Amino acid sequence: MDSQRSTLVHWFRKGLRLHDNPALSHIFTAANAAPGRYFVRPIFILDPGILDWMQVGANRWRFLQQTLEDLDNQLRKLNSRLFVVRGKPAEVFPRIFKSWRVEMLTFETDIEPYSVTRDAAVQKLAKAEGVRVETHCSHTIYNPELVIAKNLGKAPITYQKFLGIVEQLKVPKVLGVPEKLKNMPTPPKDEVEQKDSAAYDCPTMKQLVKRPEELGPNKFPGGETEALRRMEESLKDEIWVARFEKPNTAPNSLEPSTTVLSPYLKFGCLSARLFNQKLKEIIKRQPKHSQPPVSLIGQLMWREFYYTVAAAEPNFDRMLGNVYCMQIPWQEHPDHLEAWTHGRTGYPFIDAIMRQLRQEGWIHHLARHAVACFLTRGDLWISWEEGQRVFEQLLLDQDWALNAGNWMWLSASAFFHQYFRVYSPVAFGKKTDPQGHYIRKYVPELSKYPAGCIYEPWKASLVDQRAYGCVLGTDYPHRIVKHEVVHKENIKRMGAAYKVNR
Ligand SMILES: Cc1cc2nc3c(=O)[nH]c(=O)nc-3n(C[C@H](O)[C@H](O)[C@H](O)COP(=O)(O)OP(=O)(O)OC[C@H]3O[C@@H](n4cnc5c(N)ncnc54)[C@H](O)[C@@H]3O)c2cc1C
Numbered sequence: 001m002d003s004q005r006s007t008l009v010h011w012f013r014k015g016l017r018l019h020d021n022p023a024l025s026h027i028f029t030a031a032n033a034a035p036g037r038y039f040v041r042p043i044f045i046l047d048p049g050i051l052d053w054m055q056v057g058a059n060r061w062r063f064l065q066q067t068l069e070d071l072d073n074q075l076r077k078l079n080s081r082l083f084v085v086r087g088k089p090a091e092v093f094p095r096i097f098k099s100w101r102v103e104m105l106t107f108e109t110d111i112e113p114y115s116v117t118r119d120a121a122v123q124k125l126a127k128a129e130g131v132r133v134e135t136h137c138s139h140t141i142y143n144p145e146l147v148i149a150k151n152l153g154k155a156p157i158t159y160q161k162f163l164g165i166v167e168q169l170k171v172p173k174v175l176g177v178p179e180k181l182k183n184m185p186t187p188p189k190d191e192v193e194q195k196d197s198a199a200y201d202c203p204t205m206k207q208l209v210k211r212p213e214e215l216g217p218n219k220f221p222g223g224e225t226e227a228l229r230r231m232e233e234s235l236k237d238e239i240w241v242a243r244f245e246k247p248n249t250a251p252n253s254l255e256p257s258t259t260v261l262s263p264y265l266k267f268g269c270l271s272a273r274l275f276n277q278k279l280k281e282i283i284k285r286q287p288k289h290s291q292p293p294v295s296l297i298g299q300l301m302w303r304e305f306y307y308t309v310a311a312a313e314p315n316f317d318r319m320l321g322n323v324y325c326m327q328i329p330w331q332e333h334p335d336h337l338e339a340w341t342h343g344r345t346g347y348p349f350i351d352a353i354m355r356q357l358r359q360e361g362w363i364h365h366l367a368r369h370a371v372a373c374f375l376t377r378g379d380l381w382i383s384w385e386e387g388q389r390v391f392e393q394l395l396l397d398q399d400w401a402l403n404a405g406n407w408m409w410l411s412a413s414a415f416f417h418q419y420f421r422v423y424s425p426v427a428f429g430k431k432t433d434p435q436g437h438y439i440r441k442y443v444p445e446l447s448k449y450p451a452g453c454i455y456e457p458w459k460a461s462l463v464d465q466r467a468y469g470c471v472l473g474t475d476y477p478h479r480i481v482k483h484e485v486v487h488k489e490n491i492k493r494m495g496a497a498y499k500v501n502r
Helices: 022-033 059-077 089-099 113-129 142-148 159-166 191-195 224-236 236-243 262-267 272-285 296-311 334-341 348-360 367-378 384-394 400-410 437-442 462-467 484-502
Strands: 004-011 038-048 083-086 101-107 131-137
Touching: 004 022, 022 038, 022 083, 022 101, 022 131, 038 059, 038 089, 059 224, 059 262, 101 113, 101 437, 113 131, 142 159, 142 296, 159 296, 224 236, 224 262, 224 272, 236 272, 272 296, 296 400, 334 348, 334 367, 348 367, 348 384, 348 437, 367 384, 367 400, 367 484, 384 400
Parallel strands: 004 038, 004 101, 038 083, 101 131
Antiparallel strands: none
């Protein structure tokens, strides 16, 4: 096979998987249809210039490193490989369109504003250069543009309305893995590979993680292979799956009470469409089962809902200019923001959650509720954008639409408006962890406190605090605010802001 004329490119960004990947599958099918004509290059473009951006924490870089290694491993089973191309797309694509004689480029669509801008520019260049582009909406179960169209041009702004719309939509088909490449030699080295054969090899941990001191325990390895193993593990207890009720899962069990598939769904290591289809099979054969919103399918529909409102608002992650967002006069509080950011608020439940987040990169949904309420309307009266920023740095599952949507909910800025309901930083965790095992783990300086005061260590006398080895103001901070006072003030501030907006 000396005969090749062109290269077929799949561009990974999200969609970091072989299964249920129509953009990738179509490349491999086209290659096999015309033996001898094509080379195939599945690529991921890594801009070294952002390895130092503090908004990507080490834990999330490590998850990507592991994911790319797995993706490359899996593509090798198809007689292909991953090509990790270092550079910026604005410079990479002109070069490789010419160098590789690219005939077709496929990718999975992404709704985030810079991605839309970037992809429109790649698409314009491709059209000019005669490159056929095919894009697929496989990151979400439904295409937000069809949802918005079915709703007469507006995104549904309640969960029940959204369910009412998507009930009327066809469910896109879930694909298997692509065909193994037949009769295809490896691509000839381009000018970059000619100088360094390894130029497109998967990055090492050292190449990707510039701040290894931020790494915590490796609890959730990256990659499709782990994503599928973890999904199958969650699905094997079919009664647990069928009867799942999200509000009844604990925020502070030591091991996660929910699936922790969110890092996998965020990177596309797991297809949400596959997972939806598997859940539907379970629900159909388990006559006793939960329903949306609280069921596991309901959780995937939460993700769908936020992707659809976000698709219609480029400013979804900001207060100003955001069609959904109440304008609320959040205050600047640098010292309180720093304390919340580092889990030094003096409320042990809140601090344990922020410390788990920083160390491990995942915290349960209702743990996110507790700390987000505390930062914003509940206690510190700081903008939800500041909380979004910190979550963006530390979460493995950092997701532009899901982070912004849930921060607006928790701050009573959109989608949720019952701001008289406020989480108690002392009482909320006790329902599910009365001994405080979660605090003893993540705030180890309090680990000797009796369970009767570990949520509220200021209730222990100085002599008791000394006996427990941890004196407030010396070994663990005093409360930075007093919840019982400030949350009442903030309920009045929320009332005022709601009036101004009305
Ligand atoms: C302030 C705040 C910020 C959040 N930021 C993110 C984020 O950046 N990325 C993210 O993936 N989720 C985010 N969430 C939503 C949710 O808390 C996580 O999706 C969930 O904790 C992931 O754990 P799990 O995989 O065990 O979820 P499960 O309960 O097992 O749910 C399965 C999947 O459904 C989806 N899902 C579940 N709950 C929600 C929800 N409330 N909204 C949207 N999708 C949901 C996720 O893809 C999740 O993996 C945020 C929530 C809050 C309150």
